[PDB]
Amino acid sequence: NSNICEVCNKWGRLFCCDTCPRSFHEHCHIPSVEANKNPWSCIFCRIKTIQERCPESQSGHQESEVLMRQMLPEEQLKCEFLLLKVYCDSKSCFFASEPYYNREGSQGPQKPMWLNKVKTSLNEQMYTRVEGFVQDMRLIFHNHKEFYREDKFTRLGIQVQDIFEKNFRNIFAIQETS
Ligand SMILES: [Zn+2]
Ligand SMILES: [Zn+2]
Numbered sequence: 001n002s003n004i005c006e007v008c009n010k011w012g013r014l015f016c017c018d019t020c021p022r023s024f025h026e027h028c029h030i031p032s033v034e035a036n037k038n039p040w041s042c043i044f045c046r047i048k049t050i051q052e053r054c055p056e057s058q059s060g061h062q063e064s065e066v067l068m069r070q071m072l073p074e075e076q077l078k079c080e081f082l083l084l085k086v087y088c089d090s091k092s093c094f095f096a097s098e099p100y101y102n103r104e105g106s107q108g109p110q111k112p113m114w115l116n117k118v119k120t121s122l123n124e125q126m127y128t129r130v131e132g133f134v135q136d137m138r139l140i141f142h143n144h145k146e147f148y149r150e151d152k153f154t155r156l157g158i159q160v161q162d163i164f165e166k167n168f169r170n171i172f173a174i175q176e177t178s
């Protein structure tokens, strides 16, 4: 296996996948690495299994249909995976913890949102449809763009949103368009 965490790229106390070479810190994996389970398979492997069991799951879908799906176990897992793909980028650090807003000429958002809040919400089964998870993830980047206005720091929100959206389209097999 790898000797660094797949998510944050640091060494430390690592848990190794039994079915692929990836490794994880306990709370870098989502869900947090499970206490027992020998063998253990990582979220990458669990997602690959879903795909391999239902090859048709990779055919194109409409976003509006995906958003309305109830959060049954496979959709829960897919949203956990999508959240983990965003943490995989180092720029996620800007969006992880609870923000605060005190900038001349701007007012904070009405509904602050951040990655660790979405993580807790998934863990606590607070989302009943894919739509709830996706709306809170998009709200993170929309809040940032609105607050930073013309400051060049706005670009960090575009960047991390692009990682979210590309992974959303991949994981949920959204129909390709121009
Ligand atoms: Zn890590
Ligand atoms: Zn694995």
Ligand SMILES: [Zn+2]
Binding pocket: 053, 054, 055, 056
């Ligand atoms: Zn089948």
